[PDB]
Design a protein around this ligand. Structure first.
Ligand code: ZN
Ligand code: ZN
Ligand code: ZN
Lengths: 147, 93
């Protein structure tokens, strides 16, 4: 069940590769993937390359994959352990979602943070009251950890 | 498209929900077991699994597709039966 669905996703990724992310299994553990996401243009992450680890559950797609950044990133919805606060990875997961769609949602999160439901309150505070300070710090972390 | 949004394969025994969406019988059943009363595509409230999509099943009897692993041309109404038994599939899994 889950294994065939994961294989199908990998094949569709190879047949129409996305313009701004790559993803695939680590060795021949089909349930353990690594992904790369480009920092979005017009965001403070622009020019950066961010690595993610993906663990699929054995009842996928009925439970969400576990997704975390391994590259350090300064963002109000991603913490120092790489955990991602994103509703489609939790209560709003649906079985029609795919890794391709998750990666697009994470790119959208980088472009447009959600400072009102944050994972890191201190960063959300800066994002809301001093946007250019947030931009400067996020850019500095991109230059240090993602390039 | 005759694909199921849940399993991503060609529909098998398609079922249509009240919100108009069509899934394999086993896919919408398993979806509702895991997240009750909810469409697995549009998240609309669903009071039941739905009804057999006999119109979709009829249309699939005259459609054909090449097997993703052995390239043989297979009728869509028989695609699940093919991938169950195709040696190129069995070989990979
Ligand atoms: Zn299905
Ligand atoms: Zn629906
Ligand atoms: Zn075949």
């Amino acid at each position: 069940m889950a294994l065939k669905r994961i294989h199908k996703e990998l094949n569709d990724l190879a047949r129409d590769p996305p313009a701004q992310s790559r993803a695939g299994p680590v060795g021949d553990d089909m349930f353990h993937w690594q992904a790369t996401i480009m920092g979005p243009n017009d965001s403070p992450y622009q020019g950066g390359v961010f690595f993610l680890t993906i663990h699929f559950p054995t009842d996928y797609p009925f439970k969400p994959p576990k997704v975390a950044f391994t590259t350090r990133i300064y963002h109000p919805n991603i913490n120092s352990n790489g955990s991602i606060k994103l509703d489609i990875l939790r209560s709003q997961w649906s079985p029609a979602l795919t890794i391709s769609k998750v990666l697009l949602s994470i790119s959208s999160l980088l472009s447009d943070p959600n400072p009102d439901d944050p994972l890191v309150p201190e960063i959300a505070r800066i994002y809301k009251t001093d946007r250019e300070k947030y931009n400067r710090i996020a850019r500095e972390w991109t230059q240090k950890y993602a390039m | 498209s005759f694909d199921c949004a849940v399993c991503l394969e060609v529909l098998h025994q398609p079922v249509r929900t009240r919100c108009g969406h069509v899934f394999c019988r086993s896919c919408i059943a398993t979806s509702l077991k895991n997240n009750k009363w909810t469409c697995p595509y549009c998240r609309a409230y669903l009071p039941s699994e739905g009804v057999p999509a006999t119109d979709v099943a009829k249309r699939m009897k005259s459609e054909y597709k090449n097997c993703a692993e052995c390239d043989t041309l297979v009728c869509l109404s028989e695609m699940r039966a093919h991938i169950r038994t195709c040696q190129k599939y069995i070989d990979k899994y």
